[PDB]
Structure formats: C-alpha cells, structure tokens
C-alpha cells in the first residue's frame, strides 16, 4: 500500500506571554513561536541559529 | 447506473452440480461539483480559499489527489 508525502507550509503565531499583567524591568518572560516550517526533523531538536544558513528565518527586535 | 452499473461476474459449481453463475453489481454515479468561497467579500491579501467538493475527482484512496496549475 503506497503512501504519499505532502509538502505544505503552515501559519505561524508569535506570542509574548508576561508572567503578570505588566512587563516591568528585570523580568524575563517566555516568547512562544509556533512554526511547523522550522521543524525540519521529527527525531531531534532544531535550534535556530544566525550562523546556520539552513535556518532561514529568525525573529528579530 | 441502473442496467449499466459495474457488475462483477463469477461462475460457480452449485451444490446440485450445474455451473450456475453468481453476480453482483454496485452503482457508480457521478456528483455535481460545488465550488464556493469562505466569504462574500475580501480585502487586499485576505487569503481567499477555494473549497471544491466533488467526489469524482478522487482517483486513489491511498495517495493524496492533487491538481497543479499549467504554466505554458
């Protein structure tokens, strides 16, 4: 029984979630990025890297 | 459909001893393709999506059926 592989992108959603209602100074708050396009390996951990040309897109501020 | 429906034929030696055939048929009708858009109005770069529901274009229950766009 043959099985096909589908190439398809996804819509990302970058969200900043402060630990409280105000982002005061000296408070590290998590940044959550949901992007299936950067998950290029299902058996390992993919870490973004400016030095890695394979990682095409990196968030910036 | 009706008298022209796809019918499979299979001979058989019955318990009596005659070679009577046994057959079964199932209709394979078509469907009216319906295409519609998610919204009545769209803005610039509103990401319009085309939903086509027509079961006759499925040519394999295993593989994912796709239709590309001609560039020629």
TrEMBL record, chain A:
The organism of origin for this protein: Nitrosopumilus maritimus (strain SCM1)
Covered residues, full protein: 446 to 506 of 1734
The protein's name: Uncharacterized protein
